Each structure stands twice: as structure tokens, then as C-alpha cells.
Design a binder for this molecule. Structure first.
Ligand code: CU
Ligand code: CU
Ligand code: ZN
Ligand code: ZN
Lengths: 153, 153
């Protein structure tokens, strides 16, 4: 009955709280919460490798990718472990996050705990961009707000 | 060669960066870094249970204590896993942290990764206080600055 939580923060107005809940060690992880201060529309949303906030969000490194694969959408089989795809922001800048994912986990090889969650400038093209970069970052742009994923009560 | 890192931050002037490095899974963890904005003298210094920063440092919960023991100094056998004792601050407010500890770990049962590090108002009395509270918190007072412990490169 594992739970985790993460406080997203950054240099600008983007901030929020995102919760994690994995009922069973082998099972899927529900991800939910509310991010605000976001430019209206789609935003990239990924778990990055390092829980390092030394030099801001940049220190977090690249997309969490322990199985050494190419970038993709969450439904895609060929994806990064940390590729949680997009989150959608409404008029007044709020994004009411509600994802459910089976690749990430709060335990084991795929353990995201102690690593960084990151919301992004532009939308994640889910790897279907055609250019070189789309296969890596998703062309989702700069890092607006981020936070280290922590064990929750 | 597992490494971790943590950015200590808070409501007031206290801030800093603390590094972790465990060369071997079964071995001790070197803790080092630099905290500043500290009142001159001793300060309590502990790993708390939860990586929760929702409602500030208070969300972190109590001292990390999976073996259900009483508070103590780091050298004491009867201690909390997360009891790293004290850190010393010099005149100009700076505390050059350099601990080495064998109870905490960056892997397994004692895994501190994904949990919160916390620097304190007063000094930790290392459980020798005689009162009720010294057996729990170390009488080290309020939480000045804290941060979630994250996986580092
Ligand atoms: Cu990303
Ligand atoms: Cu403490
Ligand atoms: Zn990716
Ligand atoms: Zn304690």
C-alpha cells in the first residue's frame, strides 16, 4: 500500500503538488494532483533520472531511462520508463492531473522514488515528431517547474 | 558507488546543500556539504520519515525510525536510524558538515532515499536530556530548513 508525493516548484509562476499511489508492488501507479500557473494547453510531463536540485531543474538530468530505450508516449511500448506523456492546462492556468501508469513503479528496478518529476514548457510530441530531438526529449522544451519524488504517509 | 544529494531549504535564511556517498551496499555512508544562515553553535541534524514537503518541513513527520527504537546520539546503539546527531555552525553562520555513519543507508530496509533531511533550531541533546521529549525529538527544537533526499549522478 505504497504512497509517494512531490512538490513541483520553479523559477517562475508554475507550481503544484502531485501524488502517487501504488496499491500493489506488481501493479499500476495512480498519479494525481493539481499544477497551476501553466500556459493554456498541453504540457510535457516526465520523471527524470536524478533527484538532484543543485543547479535547479537542470540538475535532474535526462528522462528516466533504465532500459536504455527511445523516447515515446506512455501507451507506446518503446518508451522511457519516465515518459508519462502530457498534462492539460485549462484557461485559468490550472492542470488537474489524473494519470494511471503501469511502467513506472514505487518499488524495484523501475523505482521512481528519490528521482525528479518535471513539468515542461511545450507539449510532448510523444516521439512522433520526425526530428532527431523528438526521439530524446519529446520536443517538450524547457523545464518550468520540478521537484524530488518523496515517500509519503 | 551509490550517491545521493539533498537541497536544504526553508521559510527563513537557513539554506544549504548536503551530499551522500555509499561506496558499498553493505558499507558506511559519508555525508558532507555546507549549510549556512545558521545561528552560531550546535544544531540538530536528522533524517525524517517522509519525503513530504506539502505543508513545509512539518509534513516530513518524525525521526526515521523503522526499528521502533528510542531517540539517541549516532554513536549510541539505542538510536533512531535517522539520528545523525549534531552539526556545528561557526561565527558567520556557516556549518561545514562532514559526518560518516553506518546505521543509515542508500539501499534496502534502512534506505533514506526519498525521505527528508532536516536541520534544526537548537542542538540535539543526544537523548541524555532526562525529560520525556529528549527520548523522542532530542529537544532540538523547530525545523529551520529541510529537503527531500534524492538520487544523484
Ligand atoms: Cu521531461
Ligand atoms: Cu529532526
Ligand atoms: Zn522520454
Ligand atoms: Zn531521533
Amino acid at each position: 500500500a505504497t504512497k509517494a508525493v512531490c512538490v513541483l516548484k520553479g523559477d517562475g509562476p508554475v507550481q503544484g503538488i502531485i501524488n502517487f499511489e501504488q496499491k500493489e508492488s506488481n501493479g499500476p501507479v495512480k498519479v494525481w494532483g493539481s499544477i497551476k500557473g501553466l500556459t493554456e494547453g498541453l504540457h510535457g510531463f516526465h520523471v527524470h533520472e536524478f533527484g538532484d536540485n543543485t543547479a535547479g531543474c537542470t540538475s535532474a538530468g535526462p528522462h528516466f531511462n533504465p532500459l536504455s530505450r527511445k523516447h515515446g508516449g506512455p501507451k507506446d511500448e518503446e518508451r522511457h520508463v519516465g515518459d508519462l506523456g502530457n498534462v492539460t492546462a485549462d484557461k485559468d492556468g490550472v492542470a488537474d492531473v489524473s494519470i494511471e501508469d503501469s511502467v513506472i513503479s514505487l518499488s524495484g528496478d523501475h523505482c521512481i522514488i528519490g528521482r525528479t518529476l518535471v513539468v515542461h514548457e511545450k507539449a510532448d510530441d510523444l516521439g512522433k515528431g520526425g526530428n532527431e530531438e523528438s526521439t530524446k526529449t519529446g520536443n517538450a522544451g524547457s523545464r518550468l517547474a520540478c521537484g524530488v519524488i518523496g515517500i509519503a504517509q
